[PDB]
Amino acid sequence: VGYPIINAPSKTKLEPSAFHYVFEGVITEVDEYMKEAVDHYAGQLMSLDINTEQMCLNDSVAMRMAFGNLYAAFHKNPGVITGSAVGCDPDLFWSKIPVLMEEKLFAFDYTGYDASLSPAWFEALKMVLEKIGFGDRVDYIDYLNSGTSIFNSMINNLIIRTLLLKTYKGIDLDHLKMIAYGDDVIASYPHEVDASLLAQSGKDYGLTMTPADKSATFETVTWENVTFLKRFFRADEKYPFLIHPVMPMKEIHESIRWTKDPRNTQDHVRSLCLLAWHNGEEEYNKFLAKIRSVPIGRALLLPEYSTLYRRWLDSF
Ligand SMILES: [Ca+2]
Ligand SMILES: [Ca+2]
């Protein structure tokens, strides 16, 4: 599985596609709170019994030698134990997320995540690695102070715990159920957590937190308005217990207007149809109708809705 929009390359490596005009495009050291956050998180990772062993086979691939098994673990176990979605199949994993979350959801975005991360956060990251067995290859982290999504997601787990602890004294982290993919995060708790208050705490650690998904105000987050990896959560009409990961056409329309080479348009458009069909038939067909309003589009293999839908059902 590849993430077309989320892992979209930079515009530097892109050129206009044949569909360019067919669519439009308009806090210094580790403190008492982090320490406890480490404690709680490291504990959870232990329940996984990740293999402390090195790996059995672009130079910086020595780190794939050091943390190869760690990465493999998160990849094999995306969820609330890892607190990571890195490596999930949105088509299947979306039906599980709701079942793994506590009743009250809370989310928010970061501004300049990677840039705003103080050195302390990395020290904390090391401590987590010490407690789960990789403490001898801890120096490999200074190379940031393949696995960026992993480590950044782990730092996000430390942040949320820390902020919760500093905002509400004595809170029990055992009831925190979150999932991260880099700096994007979906989270929950049995009681309403106010993200606007977490943000105030984030300031103390040099973090800039803002309402999620471009919002002027921190509003209540719900399954009807929450997004994860830019996708919404929409239950199927025939099987409500099956959740469609719904990427907005708006995001798709923009992506189809570019490409790396005209020789990948076929693959790239395939990717986009795999995301696109979840919006519903009427939507998908209009989408293909447009693609086919230009010569190259009419020469592309585009999967018809029903086959995609039926295949999806059978995938469960
Ligand atoms: Ca065990
Ligand atoms: Ca986000």
From Swiss-Prot:
Binds 2 magnesium ions that constitute a dinuclear catalytic metal center. The magnesium ions are not prebound but only present for catalysis. Requires the presence of 3CDpro or 3CPro. Mg(2+) 2 binds at residues 109, 183. It comes from Poliovirus type 1 (strain Mahoney). It is found in: Host cytoplasmic vesicle membrane. Mg(2+) 1 binds at residues 109, 183. Residues 103-197 form the RdRp catalytic domain. Interacts with Viral protein genome-linked and with protein 3CD. Replicates the viral genomic RNA on the surface of intracellular membranes. May form linear arrays of subunits that propagate along a strong head-to-tail interaction called interface-I. Covalently attaches UMP to a tyrosine of VPg, which is used to prime RNA synthesis. The positive stranded RNA genome is first replicated at virus induced membranous vesicles, creating a dsRNA genomic replication form. This dsRNA is then used as template to synthesize positive stranded RNA genomes. ss(+)RNA genomes are either translated, replicated or encapsidated. This is RNA-directed RNA polymerase. Replication or transcription is subject to high level of random mutations by the nucleotide analog ribavirin. Transmembrane segments: none annotated. It catalyses: RNA(n) + a ribonucleoside 5'-triphosphate = RNA(n+1) + diphosphate. Its cofactor is Mg(2+). It is a peripheral membrane protein.
